């Protein structure tokens, strides 16, 4: 019932995450926008949870943890069971699809939660193209100047556009509506792909704010008593 959403930053063509366990840029305003969307709610009574895995917790700057304003979930095989609140704002998971289960449990949330983002690494958004309802990506290009930064971490984009499609002409709608954003809706072609989305440039990059929805699914089955 909880809308679940996957939202990360990546570096084009090959959708690159991550080197050797941390960003591989500093960007205030791709920060801000991550912290304005996931904290940001349109019901001031309910807060998001961000669930992230245990490399990702590991690499957030310790006086920035757990995220302000928002449920963190860590998952990690060495934890104890599906969802168990180990610190104020924090809880513990072994099992990322567990986890998703036991947050949609209206008994549980008391309809508090408003949405779930999936807030990384690689291996728990390998993990999340069949569970994400929805994919906020910021799509990074670098400025024909700048260096390429070296990477180790992608995005499945095989399958994320197998499952979804580019639907950024709803961005605006989609996000909590106090957000501001400083772009207008652009279409640009960048090394033979169509890139659509809410534009900024910072540093030696321009990037865009998109947002990818699950394809229209034919009706194979439904589950009868
Ligand atoms: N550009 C962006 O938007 C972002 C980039 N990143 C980048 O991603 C990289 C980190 O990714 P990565 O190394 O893949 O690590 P992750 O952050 O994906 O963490 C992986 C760990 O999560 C645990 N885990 C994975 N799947 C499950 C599951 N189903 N249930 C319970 N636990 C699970 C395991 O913990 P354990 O080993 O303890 O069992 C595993 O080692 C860094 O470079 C980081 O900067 C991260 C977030 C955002
Ligand atoms: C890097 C900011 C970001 N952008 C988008 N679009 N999606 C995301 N999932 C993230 C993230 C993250 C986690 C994080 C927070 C932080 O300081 C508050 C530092 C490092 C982070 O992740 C490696």
Not at 99 to 119: D, F, G, H, V
Request: hydrophobic residues 35%.
């Amino acid at each position: 019932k909880v809308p679940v959403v996957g939202i990360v930053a990546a570096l084009l063509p090959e959708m690159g995450i991550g080197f050797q366990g941390n960003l591989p840029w500093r960007l205030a305003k791709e920060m801000k926008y991550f912290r304005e969307v996931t904290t940001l709610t349109n019901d001031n009574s309910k807060q998001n949870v961000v669930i992230m895995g245990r490399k990702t917790w590991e690499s957030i700057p310790q006086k920035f943890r757990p995220l302000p304003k928002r449920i963190n979930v860590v998952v990690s095989r060495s934890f104890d069971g599906e969802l168990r609140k180990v610190e104020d704002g924090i809880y513990h998971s072994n099992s990322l699809r567990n986890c998703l289960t036991a947050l949609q449990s209206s008994l549980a949330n008391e309809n508090k939660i408003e949405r779930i983002y999936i807030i990384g690494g690689g291996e728990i958004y390998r993990q999340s193209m069949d569970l994400a309802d929805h994919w906020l990506i910021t799509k990074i290009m670098p400025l024909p100047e700048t260096t390429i930064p070296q990477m180790d971490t992608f995005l499945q984009k095989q399958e994320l556009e197998q499952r979804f499609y580019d639907n950024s002409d709803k961005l605006v709608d989609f996000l909590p509506s106090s957000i501001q954003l400083e772009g207008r809706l652009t279409s640009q072609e960048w090394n033979g792909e169509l890139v659509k989305g809410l534009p900024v440039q910072e540093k030696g990059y321009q990037f865009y704010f998109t947002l990818y929805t699950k394809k229209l699914e034919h009706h194979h089955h439904h589950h009868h008593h």
